Amino acid sequence: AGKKVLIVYAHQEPKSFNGSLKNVAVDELSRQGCTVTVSDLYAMNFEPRATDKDITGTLSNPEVFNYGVETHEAYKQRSLASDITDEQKKVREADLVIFQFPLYWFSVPAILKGWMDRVLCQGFAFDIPGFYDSGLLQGKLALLSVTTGGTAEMYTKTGVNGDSRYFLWPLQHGTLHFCGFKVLAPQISFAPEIASEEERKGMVAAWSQRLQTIWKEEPIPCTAHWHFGQ
Amino acid sequence: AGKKVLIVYAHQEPKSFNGSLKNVAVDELSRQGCTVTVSDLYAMNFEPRATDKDITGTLSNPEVFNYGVETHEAYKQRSLASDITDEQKKVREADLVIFQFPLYWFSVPAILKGWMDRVLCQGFAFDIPGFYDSGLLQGKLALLSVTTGGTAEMYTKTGVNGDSRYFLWPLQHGTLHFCGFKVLAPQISFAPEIASEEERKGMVAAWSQRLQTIWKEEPIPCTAHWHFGQ
């Protein structure tokens, strides 16, 4: 439909449940005629660490290194490391960014956290001021497709993990909404590692099926109320 | 009374506000007679990525790589990578683990997320059974000392960031409580970057003064109610 999709994918194993969800996404969006790009972070050996190597030009303050300050200035000067600007090009061109990952400690795997830390820099993804609904990636969509060890039941208000929406807050609100994304409803595939084959098949089909009508979805209200209720 | 403290520290710059807070902790805990160890992650060029390099020798299934399974087995077989087991030794010996870090996207910097992902493996930090109250690090204390870009006001329930307790949930509950830590109240130093020198000195003194009686502290009730309730 003229639409461009970036999938940022964070799993080590192509045959994994995550690998299958990523491939289903590529297959279905490709079938629709979408332009599709995948950043396979582990295969890229993507650098997760925020360091002074991310700036190649003269530092604003070479005596006391401030990562946010220096990357902001390097973005404006175009002296960021090229692995960062490679990702920024993908994001800039994308209409929808899908994140495909296993839940690691109620969050993204570190290699994907590094992508968020390094790619979404000041000047590119937001400004101060110029964030949340004024973020610089406004007009773009984002979607978290996450798999969990824990069951849906564990991820309820009265379950040991609390509601699943609780752990989405830093990702959907603190990061994506902050940068101006509108956020589509998460795809959460609960506990595939202990699900039956039928249940596993059912979770993969649910995702493929959803993707058929993804461009007709409205985003969530990315608010404290949506995440926490009551 | 010989208490052992591990400080896991994630900042690039010794002269930073985080650097000063880390140094205050070392100084004060050292003064008290405590045994103190610091894992300076950036200085160590600590590996954040969860990969098959974290298992030495032969994988337990060389055709389909499952990080969780492989590291569980490697832990039991004494064949984890030495950077991991070095950290596990420090944690094993510690009575208190302090994490010192700037807030990156409502969470820990990726290098510290990588520490959590790779060090806190099944068999070491948790198991079936042994999680939440019975996690394998029960008896230990953990404390998050965080600095933010955003103001205290932004981190209120109706402020644009929401309550700071909202972003603590994945860290304190999903990670630390899950491994059996009792969680000490977080230390949150709001917006040192725009604070006055006097305000900044006050935040450092608050931390130094808190450390004087840290062994007298009651842990928080690490509950959904604490994080999300009234």
Ligand SMILES: Cc1cc2nc3c(=O)[nH]c(=O)nc-3n(C[C@H](O)[C@H](O)[C@H](O)COP(=O)(O)OP(=O)(O)OC[C@H]3O[C@@H](n4cnc5c(N)ncnc54)[C@H](O)[C@@H]3O)c2cc1C
């Ligand atoms: C460091 C770390 C931290 C973690 N922290 C948390 C946490 O805080 N909370 C939590 O809930 N979980 C946590 N987990 C667990 C983790 O989220 C799950 O193990 C992960 O989400 C499972 O996804 P996967 O792709 O690895 O599953 P896989 O093990 O790859 O897949 C599960 C099963 O599905 C099968 N499968 C693959 N493709 C298909 C297909 N096409 N059709 C049918 N079946 C298929 C696979 O063969 C496998 O048998 C953590 C794990 C690690 C390693």
Ligand SMILES: Cc1cc2nc3c(=O)[nH]c(=O)nc-3n(C[C@H](O)[C@H](O)[C@H](O)COP(=O)(O)OP(=O)(O)OC[C@H]3O[C@@H](n4cnc5c(N)ncnc54)[C@H](O)[C@@H]3O)c2cc1C
């Ligand atoms: C990738 C990224 C993502 C981020 N995401 C978020 C986010 O989601 N939410 C949010 O709120 N913020 C976010 N931030 C901002 C970040 O949390 C703050 O910039 C950081 O906490 C500032 O801490 P610092 O140690 O670097 O401060 P510094 O810049 O090092 O210090 C502030 C001032 O204190 C001074 N100082 C140092 N030592 C002392 C001392 N002993 N006594 C008095 N003054 C002293 C310093 O010289 C400096 O002038 C993000 C930043 C980055 C880079």
Ligand SMILES: CN(C)c1ccc2cc3ccc(N(C)C)cc3[nH+]c2c1
């Ligand atoms: C009901 N099931 C199957 C679950 C439920 C919760 C879980 C929580 C985890 C936390 C960390 C972790 N690793 C560090 C590997 C693996 C986990 N596996 C889980 C599996």
Ligand SMILES: CN(C)c1ccc2cc3ccc(N(C)C)cc3[nH+]c2c1
């Ligand atoms: C009240 N002030 C000054 C603030 C408030 C919120 C902020 C949020 C941020 C998010 C990411 C980031 N980086 C990616 C550098 C820098 C941020 N700086 C902030 C500064």
Ligand SMILES: [Zn+2]
């Ligand atoms: Zn939001």
Ligand SMILES: [Zn+2]
């Ligand atoms: Zn075990």
Ligand SMILES: [Zn+2]
């Ligand atoms: Zn808890």
